[PDB]
Amino acid sequence: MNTVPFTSAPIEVTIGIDQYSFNVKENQPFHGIKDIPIGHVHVIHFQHADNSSMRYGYWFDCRMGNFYIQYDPKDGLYKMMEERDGAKFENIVHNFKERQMMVSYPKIDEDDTWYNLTEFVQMDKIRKIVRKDENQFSYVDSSMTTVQENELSDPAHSLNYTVINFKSREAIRPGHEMEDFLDKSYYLNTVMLQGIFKNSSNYFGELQFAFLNAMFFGNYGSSLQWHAMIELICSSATVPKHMLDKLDEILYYQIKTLPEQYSDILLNERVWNICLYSSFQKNSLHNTEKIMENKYPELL
Amino acid sequence: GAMNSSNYAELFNNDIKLFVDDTNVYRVTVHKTFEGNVATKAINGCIFTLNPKTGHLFLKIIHTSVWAGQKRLSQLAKWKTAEEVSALVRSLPKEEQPKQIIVTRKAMLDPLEVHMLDFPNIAIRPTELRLPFSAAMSIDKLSDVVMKATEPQMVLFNIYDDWLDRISSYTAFSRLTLLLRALKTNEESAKMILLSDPTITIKSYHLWPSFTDEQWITIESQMRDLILTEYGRKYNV
């Protein structure tokens, strides 16, 4: 079990740790988060009580270093930092635990939610979407735009998701205009899977990462990416059987985890009705279709 | 974006553009089978691609063989349309390619956009105008040529004949739409009006009779009365 200690909590903030969150009052004696499960990526995220503008946060993997949060009064945000001195770090974490100034990552043992949402997500790939290689963790926030959004402005702070565009020369083979536009199998399997992502896991990992950025930061371009990657699969007549089954699990846990009240803004009505009811894969997402119809039948 | 009443004059500026109408691409007769079921028999169609400024009608004849062995023909027709318009643009020299293509039905937007990805600088636009281009098969001649075709074939007509020698493209387009609206609302009457007078003939290279300016005014007035006539017959007004 790993720890993300905090130097302090100088400003009132809602702190998020994966799908959990808690309130920290201005200058409350808070020194971080303990018992974080090794083996998964994690995201620690923040919404200031005084300005819920800018949710922001850090994707990280405790196996990649010792990380702590420290408020920066100049830049005005909780910053993740790496401590290279491993002994200093252990000493700090031990003191804070002894004084019990840490909240415990509150994982229910029966609960595989976080694993199921991050199954295919790898820090290595996160660090390619979020380019800031001097750090081993990755900063995301609400307002970061995607490479594709900048096409239609600061490239250093972009989300470098894989550009999917159904009406693009990449998506459409000359001579198969109708075929490729109505059955996107070539684009999914040949261009994206074999060509860009190399395998389904890397595809699913970006899809999951897009969803999580959409959910935790209300990052709109992430939501566009999540929906595009779903639609590309659902609009392919030919998808490996294991990918469909896994897709259905992936989306099931994403829909299960989405706040009931945030559905209106994170769920694209057109994409979901198309995917569940019109697309080639309309009959292949049984779990997802069942949770969607019972939880968000309005949208449908 | 969309083409409507507000920007109606853009059609006649000097930016090359084409209207594309696909309403006569896929045409069928519906008949009873010996078993008493219903079947369709395709008949030749055409893509109506019109430069509203110059009067050029690039009339691509869609021979029924294009449908042979194909499923979902109403949907294929939009993609065939797109494929042919794209081929027409590619065949055209750069300085002749349209800057915009306006499709009369929105269902053509995605097919043509996809077929024209090689031409990102050609704007594909819908229109809110109800244009009567479906009646193009009522222009006597046009019905005759698309129905005699035995193979795919592109035919050129000036749909304005030599009118632009005497009127602007705005006025020519308005004459054309009024003629087509009339033919669409009551084809028998419309043709009666156009041909009542045997002394006025249709030139070999023309679609319409050689009316004098004064005779066009009379003709145009009679076509309005017809459209107004059918309007009352339809609505009992």
Ligand SMILES: COC(=O)CN(C)C(=O)Cc1c(Cl)cccc1Cl
């Ligand atoms: C080379 O391919 C072409 O289609 C050349 N072209 C644009 C025309 O023939 C235009 C035209 C038409 Cl369609 C009808 C009457 C007169 C004229 Cl000029």
